[PDB]
Design a protein around this ligand. Structure first.
Ligand code: NA
Ligand code: NA
Ligand code: NA
Ligand code: NA
Lengths: 94, 94
């Protein structure tokens, strides 16, 4: 598992960050509650930078997608990024 | 499980419909490859109507969301609608 994805996995699951970034109730997507605060408060802890645009670009390079209503916060998803599915994470690729 | 969701579960998983509606590779979302054809060819088989707008409205009433790129076909998702997770399906509610 690439270091970016190992860090992403850890930071999403970390209870200490859940007020800003956490798994959905079933773990098939993850929620960033406040993008500005996430970039200033969580990203330095895990990546030693605070650049949301770089982070989102990296998610895009790995094929992550956004979850939106059929009809600031953001919800991301990847078929192979699922809480508890440690071996499936190996399928997330650039 | 409400009849709409039982039918949805069956039709997504049905190999005979997979050219038009199928689970994603990990089963955490589902893809409609061609909405017009899906409405004319799959919906009558399972619901005895051909109205895409009614179907999508029903998905919205149950809290389904759409999956889109970070930067016709459509991909839908619900935290509690996951291939193989039969008991989790009980949590999908109006
Ligand atoms: Na967690
Ligand atoms: Na977290
Ligand atoms: Na299937
Ligand atoms: Na199918």
């Amino acid at each position: 598992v690439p270091a970016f994805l190992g860090k992403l996995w850890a930071l999403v699951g970390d209870p200490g960050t859940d007020h800003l970034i956490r798994w959905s109730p079933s773990g098939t997507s993850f929620l960033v509650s406040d993008q500005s605060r996430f970039a200033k408060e969580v990203l330095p802890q895990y990546f030693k930078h605070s650049n949301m645009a770089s982070f989102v670009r990296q998610l895009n390079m790995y094929g992550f997608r956004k979850v939106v209503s059929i009809e600031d916060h953001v919800e991301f998803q990847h078929p192979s990024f699922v809480r508890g599915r440690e071996q499936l994470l190996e399928r997330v690729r650039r």
